[PDB]
Symmetry: C2
Subunit: 131 residues, 2 copies
């Protein structure tokens, strides 16, 4: 299994597309080419959409990436009435199969947060491998 | 950076080695070739050694890997004398930078264990 952890920052909260480093493009998104697409779905919402790899300037996720995130935020708001996606929340991407992924938001309040935040340490990006 | 989580199982204990699968070789050990070495230190011990990637005959970690693991075991034994590496303990490898790694044993009782085991499963 492989997982990609990304901490939310103002650039994500503001921009329409999330930047990723080259290591992530190769080791997690399978060396994708510009304008390639992968399927991605949100864990709480089962909202599924197409997310694009944009390699101009630097590697970025686009397409449906923010709609998936927003759908997950919508599910969390059902239980956490006053919740907005915020800085230092963690995005957890799971590789399912080739060009298929899942996405989950790890809140500060989540029981997994301290350990996952512990692993991310200083970076904003981390790949976690197992098996 | 990246992290590789390897649960101790009966194969590791029986075969007395950490096998290397193709995906881990490519994405965590940077497509190392046979006999390439990386630096690796144990977290609790700060014991530093060289770990070889041995692809001939049975792909595996080699070189100093056994000395790093036991050095961590020895640190754990300071506070739990009967501790031995056991099934379901988790090996936490961290990629620091190119050819440079750290290793830590996560026991069942470590407060990090349940969350890390959750990722594995």
């Amino acid at each position: 299994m492989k997982v990609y952890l990304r901490k939310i920052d103002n650039q994500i909260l503001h921009n329409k597309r999330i930047s990723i480093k080259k290591g992530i493009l190769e080791h997690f998104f399978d060396k994708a080419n510009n304008q390639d697409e992968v399927d991605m779905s949100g864990i709480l919402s089962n909202y599924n959409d197409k997310v694009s790899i944009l390699l101009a300037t630097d590697p970025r996720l686009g397409g449906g990436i923010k709609r998936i995130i927003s759908a997950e935020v919508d599910k969390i708001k059902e239980n956490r009435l006053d919740y907005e996606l915020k800085i230092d929340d963690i995005l957890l991407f799971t590789y399912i199969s080739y060009k298929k992924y899942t996405l989950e938001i790890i809140l500060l309040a989540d029981t997994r947060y301290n350990v996952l935040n512990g692993l991310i340490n200083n970076s904003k990006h981390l790949l976690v491998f197992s098996e």
